[PDB]
């Protein structure tokens, strides 16, 4: 065992406090097409978003990886995160998000279209 | 368990006042003759079941793993060489088994539970033709025969107020 | 029996697929995954009828796996027995258990108590077979049975057969 | 040397600032849980012991214990100890009739090493022999060491 | 007799019998020493409470004593259930003779190991028809 | 190491989700179990060798679901199983957002 | 969608008209609208799928006797589809066995005289299928056509089935 | 409105209740010397119509459940005579955008 006068605080222990102090619709339904908002009347940003852009370069990082086909030509880059980070610089990634509103409805916005602003 | 007796948890006040909760029993006769035909009824339903369970086609069982597999997923475990029924662990031949042997068996010790049994059926029917007084403690008490001298027991029935059972 | 039913399957690209013709790839693996593949729910699938339009929707990417998942819908004729349907076929196997008749994609094992008393199994005939005072039930032999019993796994599909009914047996 | 860091004198480490024995005892025993099961302090081999640790049992001796002196390294068996077991199981495929007992030996810890300081073989009040094995290492300061 | 229910596990690459096996508790790895093939991965290495079975036999039990909020008149009743139990008979009069070996030998301040070699001494001359009418004491003294 | 309760919370508030699952999952304990369509219980008998899944009761042999969970969540669902608590998992949902 | 277990349901059988909850009577297609169970004899089955094999033959080019019709259709097989084709090369030497009709006029004058009954599609493919002679044999072999078809009308279309049958 | 002066004798709080329409709402004079809304703490509550309720809920996908409460025991929604289901827009200032719309359901 061990004995040691340092106090090293016990991280992930309020049980110990707990213990201390115990006492005091109408458009959509089910899953129909209607769920999918069609592209004219999109209301949800034009703006890739931080975790967008994060979860396209890992998921075209992980396929490039995997050997997938790359969409842009390369200058002597081997590392998968950017030969993705060059496929979205020049817009060649060919994924889709899929924006889910709270109702459960979605919009489709292409990684094309959509503006990466960060 | 089977409704042939019941029992009474009525105690008294001897005069020595050495009173115990005493128990009697005695014998309630709807409720009796309605376990009896219950009982007699759903023992041939399940004799039944099981030699209509016997009627169906034996299957196999293997020896060496103590468990059975019937014909309709002893297919599933027939060997490449279409011949023997190889166990899907032990991986041994299945062996057969006897449930349709036994079938003429079954019968016939349903026959032997029948012939024996018609006093009950007949009974069964008197008892259902003609119609049965639905006794408890308190009316068996007035056909009594005693059985004891010094009976500590007392046979008079003690009225209560307030029991709502 | 043969039957033409609506079907869909979830099928999975790995991303080395991912190109121009990635529509062809998921024909092709719908070919080579469904055509003669065994499903208890909807029988023994044969061939994929309407080829030229086979309803290929957005695809989603499995968000650790990295691969592509599409539901493909489609038309094919499937082959899923019954208990109690009568079929025709010819026997590929036979022994003291039983004899098995092929049926469509399928092998039907007929078990040695279900056949007429007279009907007794000859293993000194080469092949071996079941002879009785009228008729011979050997290989390649055509026949009429009836199957009483259906098992059906995921992906395995099993049938009993019996010929002790009047009319059936051999053809 | 910044949010509470040192910088020591490599030169002075050399010529032995702040150098530390540190000593640890390991310390087994055999016991008698019953008639023929009983542990026993030995050297084991691999055909007739199961379960045997994959670092080195070349260090020990008759007894099963090494000499004092004998520097040690981690995941070396320091004790050697056998245990009894019951004869033709099958167990991990590698299971005959020759593993008449398995190991139960102690080891040194993973992450140490050193020399055998001492050994000391005595009784316990049960009059079971049990031993005591000191090992002794040295500590030269190093980055990340708390003065 | 019986189904095997037993693996045996070798390297599916080597094809040899025995396999040399080595079981790396560091990396949670069972390997083929022979290729390196990882055969087996995520190895396993209180919660419960010690219980030999060569001195009690297979025998799990547990008491009933005072919590921390408990009214005593719950204990008593449960006290006497386990008491007023007549499967276990065998089991409570050969425990009451382990204690008397016990006390005995700690009257007389005998080591564990005499304690534990007459507590077996006991439960294997226990039950036999050659001593039936011999006194306790007896059998007491000769185990010790 | 303990990546713990506020850890998992940090990384929450980066928004790392997959790394959450990564170390939640792949990290500690990732164990691949089978239920059925019709009761969400984990008691399917599965024979991969053989290829053969069944549940008993519900006698269904061809609507066998895949998951992967925790072998900490599983022992939680049959630790309420125990304690007489359906934790009953499904794979489609029921209700509308 | 209401979640009960619903784990009781009768066995699935034939003479009872049972082939489970998803080969009712109706079904739900691809575009969303019901229709008819499609149930193919085998003869049908046979043409069908042949005509897929040829189809097929024909958007890869552009991208009768019982021995002469084997071999044919053999090649057929090995032109059009790749792998894993154990089990369809058995359904197309059973067709082409156990075919009662040979060609598209023929068949589909089978299924115009079944659709004439207004009769189940599981019935009339069994009856299109089994190569029966009487009405008693029929009655026997489909235990569903029992209280269904008149015993007249049934002989006396299993009489034009015969006829109906070459080869 | 009634307004009374001390108290309601509960004899009479059971027919306060009415025939609808007809609806009662009771007032102490105490509580209501000061009004509560003149508050800076109190910020402006507008009653919603059926269909500007029907659009909120529309526009912002929501349902009933789904929206910010206000108790039918508050002291604004007593003012404004709130009934279950009825929904206020809420202006506030906000010191991030100036003006800020809140929205809140009685229950
Ligand atoms: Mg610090
Ligand atoms: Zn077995
Ligand atoms: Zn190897
Ligand atoms: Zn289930
Ligand atoms: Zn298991």
New binding site residues.
């Given amino acids: 065992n061990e004995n040691f006068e340092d106090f090293d605080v016990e991280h992930f222990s309020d049980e110990e406090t707990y213990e201390e102090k115990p006492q005091f619709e109408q458009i959509r339904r089910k899953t129909l097409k209607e769920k999918a908002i069609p592209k004219d009347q999109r209301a949800t940003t034009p703006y890739m978003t931080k975790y967008e852009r994060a979860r396209i370069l890992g998921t075209r990082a992980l396929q490039i990886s995997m050997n997938a086909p790359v969409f842009v030509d390369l200058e002597g880059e081997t590392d998968p995160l950017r030969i993705a980070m060059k496929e979205l610089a020049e817009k060649k990634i060919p994924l889709v998000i899929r924006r889910y509103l709270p109702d459960g409805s979605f919009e489709d916005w292409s990684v094309e279209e959509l503006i990466v602003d960060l | 368990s089977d409704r042939l007796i019941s029992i009474h948890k009525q105690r008294e006040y001897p005069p020595n006042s050495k009173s115990v909760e005493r128990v009697y029993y005695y014998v309630k006769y709807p409720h009796a003759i309605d376990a009896i035909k219950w009982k007699v009824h759903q023992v041939v339903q399940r004799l039944k079941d099981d030699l209509d369970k016997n009627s169906e086609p034996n299957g196999y069982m293997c020896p060496i793993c103590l468990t059975k597999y019937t014909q309709l997923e002893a297919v599933q475990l027939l060997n490449f060489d279409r011949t023997e029924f190889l166990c899907s662990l032990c991986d041994e031949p299945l062996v057969e088994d006897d449930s349709g042997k036994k079938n003429k068996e079954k019968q016939d010790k349903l026959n032997r539970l029948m012939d024996q049994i018609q006093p009950i059926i007949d009974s069964l029917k008197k008892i259902d033709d003609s119609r049965i007084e639905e006794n408890t403690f308190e009316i068996a008490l007035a056909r009594l025969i005693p059985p004891q001298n010094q009976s500590h027991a007392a046979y008079t029935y003690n009225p209560k107020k307030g029991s709502t059972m | 029996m043969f039957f033409i039913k609506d079907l869909s399957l979830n099928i999975t690209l790995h991303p080395s697929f991912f190109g121009p013709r990635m529509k062809q790839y998921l024909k092709t693996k719908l070919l080579e995954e469904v055509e003669g593949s065994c499903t208890g729910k909807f029988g023994y699938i044969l061939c994929v009828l309407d080829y030229d339009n086979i309803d290929i929707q957005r695809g989603r990417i499995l968000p650790t796996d990295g691969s592509a998942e599409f539901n493909v819908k489609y038309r094919a004729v499937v082959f899923k027995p019954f208990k109690g349907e009568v079929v025709d076929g010819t026997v590929v196997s036979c022994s003291q258990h039983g004899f098995e008749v092929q049926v469509g994609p399928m092998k039907v094992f007929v078990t040695k108590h279900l056949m007429p008393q007279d009907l007794t199994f000859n293993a000194g005939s080469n092949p071996p077979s079941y002879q009785s005072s009228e008729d011979v039930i050997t290989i390649k032999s055509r026949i009429r049975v009836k199957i009483e019993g259906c098992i059906s796994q995921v992906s395995s599909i099993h049938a009993i057969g019996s010929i002790k009914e009047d009319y059936l047996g051999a053809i | 040397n910044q949010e509470d860091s040192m910088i020591m004198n490599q030169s002075s480490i050399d010529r032995g600032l702040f150098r530390s024995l540190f000593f640890r005892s390991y310390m087994d025993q055999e016991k008698k849980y019953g008639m023929s099961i009983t542990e026993t302090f030995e050297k084991p081999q691999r055909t007739n012991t199961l379960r045997m640790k994959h670092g080195t049992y070349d260090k020990l001796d008759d007894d099963g214990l090494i000499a004092p002196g004998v520097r040690v390294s981690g995941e070396d068996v320091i004790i050697g100890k056998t245990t009894p077991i019951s004869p033709d199981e099958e167990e991990l495929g590698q299971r005959t009739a020759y593993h008449s007992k398995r190991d139960a030996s102690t080891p040194l810890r993973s992450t140490e090493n050193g020399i055998v300081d001492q050994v000391l073989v005595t009784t316990n009040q049960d009059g079971l022999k049990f031993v005591k094995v000191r090992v002794r290492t040295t500590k030269i300061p190093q980055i990340g060491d708390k003065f | 007799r019986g189904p095997n229910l037993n693996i045996v596990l070798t390297?599916p690459?080597?094809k040899?019998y025995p396999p040399k096996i080595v079981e790396r508790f560091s990396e949670g790895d069972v390997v083929?020493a022979?290729?390196g093939?990882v055969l087996s991965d995520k190895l396993v290495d209180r919660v419960g409470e010690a219980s030999n079975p060569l001195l009690d036999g297979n025998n799990l039990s547990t008491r009933i004593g005072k919590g921390e909020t408990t009214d005593m008149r719950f204990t008593k009743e449960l006290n006497k259930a386990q008491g007023k139990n007549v499967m276990d008979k065998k089991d409570n009069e050969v425990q009451a003779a382990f204690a008397k070996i016990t006390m005995l030998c700690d009257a007389a301040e005998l080591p564990k190991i005499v304690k534990d070699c007459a507590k077996e001494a006991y439960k294997l001359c226990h039950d036999e028809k050659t001593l039936k009418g011999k006194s306790m004491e007896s059998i007491m003294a000769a185990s010790i | 190491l303990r990546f713990g309760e506020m850890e998992r919370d940090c990384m929450i508030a980066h928004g790392a989700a997959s790394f959450l699952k990564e170390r939640l999952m792949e990290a500690s304990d990732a164990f691949r179990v089978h239920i059925c369509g019709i009761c969400g219980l984990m008691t399917v008998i599965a024979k991969l060798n053989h290829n053969q899944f069944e549940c008993k009761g519900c006698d269904n042999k061809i609507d066998i679901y895949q998951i992967h969970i925790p072998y900490a969540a599983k022992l939680l669902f049959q630790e309420l199983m125990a304690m007489n608590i359906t934790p009953r998992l499904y794979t489609d949902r029921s209700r509308d957002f | 969608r209401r979640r009960r277990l619903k784990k009781v349901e009768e066995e699935e059988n034939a003479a009872t008209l049972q082939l489970g909850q998803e080969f009712q009577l109706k079904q739900i297609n691809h575009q969303g609208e019901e229709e008819e169970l499609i149930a193919l004899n085998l003869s049908e089955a046979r043409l069908v799928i042949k005509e897929a094999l040829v189809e097929r033959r024909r958007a890869f080019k552009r991208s009768e006797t019982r021995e002469k019709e084997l071999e044919s259709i053999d090649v057929l097989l090995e032109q059009t589809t790749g792998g894993n084709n154990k089990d369809l090369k058995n359904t197309m030497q059973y067709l082409t066995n156990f075919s009662r009709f040979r060609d598209q006029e023929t068949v589909g004058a089978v299924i115009q005289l079944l659709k004439s009954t207004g009769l189940h599609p599981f019935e009339v493919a069994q009856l299109g299928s089994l190569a029966c002679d009487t009405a008693d044999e029929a009655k026997t072999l489909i235990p569903s056509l029992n209280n269904k078809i008149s015993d007249d009308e049934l002989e006396r279309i299993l009489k034009e089935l015969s006829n109906l049958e070459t080869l | 409105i009634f307004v009374y002066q001390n108290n309601i004798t509960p004899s009479a709080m059971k027919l306060v209740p009415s025939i609808p329409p007809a609806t009662i709402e009771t007032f102490n004079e105490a509580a209501l010397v000061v009004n509560i809304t003149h508050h800076e703490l109190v910020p402006k509550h507008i009653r919603l119509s059926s269909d500007e309720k029907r659009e909120l809920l529309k526009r912002y996908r929501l349902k009933e459940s789904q929206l910010p409460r206000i108790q039918r025991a508050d002291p604004v929604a007593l003012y404004l005579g709130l009934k279950r289901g009825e929904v206020v827009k809420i202006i506030r200032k906000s010191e991030t955008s100036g003006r800020y719309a809140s929205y809140r359901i009685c229950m």
């Fill in positions: 390297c690459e080597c040899v083929c022979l290729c093939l």
